[PDB]
Design a protein around this nucleic acid. Sequence first.
RNA 1: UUUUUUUUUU
Length: 798
Amino acid sequence: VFIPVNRTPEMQEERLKLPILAEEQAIMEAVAEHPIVIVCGETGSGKTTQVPQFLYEAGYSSEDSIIGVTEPRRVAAVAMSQRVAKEMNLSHRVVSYQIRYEGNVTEETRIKFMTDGVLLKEIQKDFLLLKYKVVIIDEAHERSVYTDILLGLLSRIVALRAKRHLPLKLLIMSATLRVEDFTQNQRLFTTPPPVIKVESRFPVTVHFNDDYSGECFRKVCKIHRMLPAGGILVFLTGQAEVHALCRRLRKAFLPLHVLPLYSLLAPEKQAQVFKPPPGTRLCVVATNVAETSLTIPGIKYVVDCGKVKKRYYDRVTGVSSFRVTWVSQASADQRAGRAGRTEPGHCYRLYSSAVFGDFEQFPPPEITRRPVEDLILQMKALSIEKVINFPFPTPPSVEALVAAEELLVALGALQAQLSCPITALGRTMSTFPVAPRYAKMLALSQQHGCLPYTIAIVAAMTVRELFEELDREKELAELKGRRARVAQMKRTWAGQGPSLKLGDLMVLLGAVGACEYAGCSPQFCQANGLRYKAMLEIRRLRGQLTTAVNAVCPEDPKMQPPTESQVTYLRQIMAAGLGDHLARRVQSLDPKWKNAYKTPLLDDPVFIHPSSVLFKELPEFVVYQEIVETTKMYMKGVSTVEIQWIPSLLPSYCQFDAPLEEPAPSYCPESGQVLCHRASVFYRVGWPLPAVQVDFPEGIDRYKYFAKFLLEGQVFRKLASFKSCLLSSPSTMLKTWARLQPRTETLLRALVAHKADSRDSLLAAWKKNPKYLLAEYCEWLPKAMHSDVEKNWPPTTD
RNA sequence: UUUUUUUUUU
């Protein structure tokens, strides 16, 4: 049971400062008595660090059974692993972190810190989480997509483990007080788990009072002249406000060190905030990064916009947009908490006391605001067929769940309309750590040696804000030259000719290749307008994407430039990934459509993005990565599609009239199926598409054509020897002068009975009984031949 | 056709 730690005297006093220590036996008694415990403790409560220690003291860690702790951030995983390992007297062999592309875990590991996504991937490998006896899910109040999928899954895992008489304990740790979606949720936890509230210790003063930027300049002005020396933090909506206020404040200046903070800021400039100020007071203009991501020790006065920037996905169109709205009360309070963490602090809210009540208490969960295809593909891999049966803490919209299954079926991830389970292709995609669209690109890309190219493109698309912003006399020319420098570079990476057809996606590839060519130089990144932090993240992601692919397909990471054929094959892999994102140029009217494109998903005209390399080229068909609305509805991530590609690449999105007699249907040896040329038209828009070789539609005519090719020996080459001796032509399966011939019906009926319209279908039928078509096939040969046929009847080897 | 990303987990 009990396990020692050997506390050092100096860390003892610190540890005793935190409040949760008093309630240790209370939390440990709850954990023993209940299967699931919810621990609610504000920042500084020390719950995250100490609760794994308590359970370690109670002996939950063991050989097969360890304590796990899941976190939203990578940083919080590693940092927490280190702090606990030092707060206890234990090696990082015992207390470890696992994050995306780094590791710390050993058989010695008894407390494991991890990101929520890492736990999900373990749930894929073993759904029972046998290697865990306790799982702690921390920062549940953040309600990230992975916390939600984890909480719903673990309720089932806890149940499955319990009936196996191997109890798994789940502890849910929340900084905020409200857990209604957990306690009141009948589907998630049939019995409301006990809720433990831990108080913690530096009070925050809140002051209530068109453009939030102006008042903030005033507030920062008024505070600074008036109040004692202490850190100033201002929350602003976006980067340009941050820069507008910093330059404005620098112009304004007794002491003041002005530092702008935003997530994409260069890590060097970022770091300036934490270090204390050089007769100069600290005032930092920041986005939400200061609210959670960064903790600034010297801050004593915060000024609050009252406004957040968020990204909204339109379900009908699929389109994304960036809008500014009122903060949540919890976001408003948490921003205030930043003010007074190591001294009494001041929060001045630029909204009225009345406005604060108008705020939505809790921000909407991140799952409801975005496509959920990645999760459902994960859920389908765990055999969760009925998505609505899943116990979402907050369920996503119906249209969101229906859209996802439509996309995942369209990629081939989910089979077949009564149900759609994961496919073999869908199962291997589930392993890849990227969105299922790019996941299919990866699975599709295992050919022509462009796999590292596609891995690089996908990695460059998955990363956010690849290119440095560089926006908003002699100083303007320095900045303006940089833009022309980066634009010229973007064009240089994307060649002219077939290379330019890959467009923006080629520009990402050429950016990744050029960066790796210079050994990912920070000098190179600043020279060519690439972002250094993003480029490193690109490199790490390519590594993890390359290792994952090797698991699926047994077979030099930093690459060499592609040949023209490779670039066009890259175009086809990308178009197949982005099938739902196809636009056609308009030619015929309204002045709004002069250079526009039309996409079936939305009525409005869409345009190539002005910074895109395909902007002036304006090809007739493109696939876009995403559509973002600002002033117009713009296509970003654009690549060219050759119109004839569409039916062979995106057959699910097309509608074919009838199979064509000219050219006549053929048999495909690789597929094992009947092919035919079919004319097609895109589903909602009505775009005419040429006739191309496509699989023959399922139907009674398909069986006839397959039966013809089988008798000719094309389907199975063992039967090909007999083709000379057949009594009537194989052609009589389609049409015959001998109407009363029974030969053709008997073969066709037997084929229908076993749904044998393909090599794989018939080969399957021969497993269930290997003499399946023997009688019927013999009907087509003279009797003397029958015995030799039966002797080698399976016309398949193996 | 003319560029206006908040924040983060595999």
